[PDB]
Structure formats: C-alpha cells, structure tokens
C-alpha cells in the first residue's frame, strides 16, 4: 500500500511594503514590488523542485 504527502507554504506582502518600496540609489515612482513578487513566485517554484 502506497500513500502520498502534502506540501504548502505562503507569503504575505504588507500594505507599506506594497505601497512604497523604492530604489536605493535612485528616485522612482513606486512600482518596484512587482519584480519582488515575481522573484518570490519563482523562488517558491524552485522550492517545490528542491523538495
């Protein structure tokens, strides 16, 4: 008899992380958190491949 397992994890982005996150050596309008969500998405995909 065989039986599989289950795997989950999660993220939260707060309001003052989403609302304002700027460049460190530049002054741009706040649109930087989209790339941060993209990297965390790709990192969770890699985390599943690691398992």
């Amino acid at each position: 008899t065989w039986s599989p397992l289950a795997f989950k994890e999660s993220r939260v982005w707060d309001e003052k992380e989403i609302l304002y996150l700027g460049r460190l050596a530049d002054e741009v309008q706040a649109g930087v958190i989209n790339e941060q969500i993209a990297e965390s998405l790709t990192w969770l995909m890699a985390r599943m491949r690691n398992r």
């Binding site: 460049r23 460190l24 050596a25 530049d26």
Partner: peptide, 10 residues
C-alpha cells in the same frame, strides 16, 4: 532577491 539599487548610479 536583489538589493534593488540602480547600478549605473551607485
């Protein structure tokens, strides 16, 4: 993750 700097200005 990267430290979100601008490269050609730091």
């Amino acid at each position: 993750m990267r430290v979100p700097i601008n490269i050609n200005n730091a």
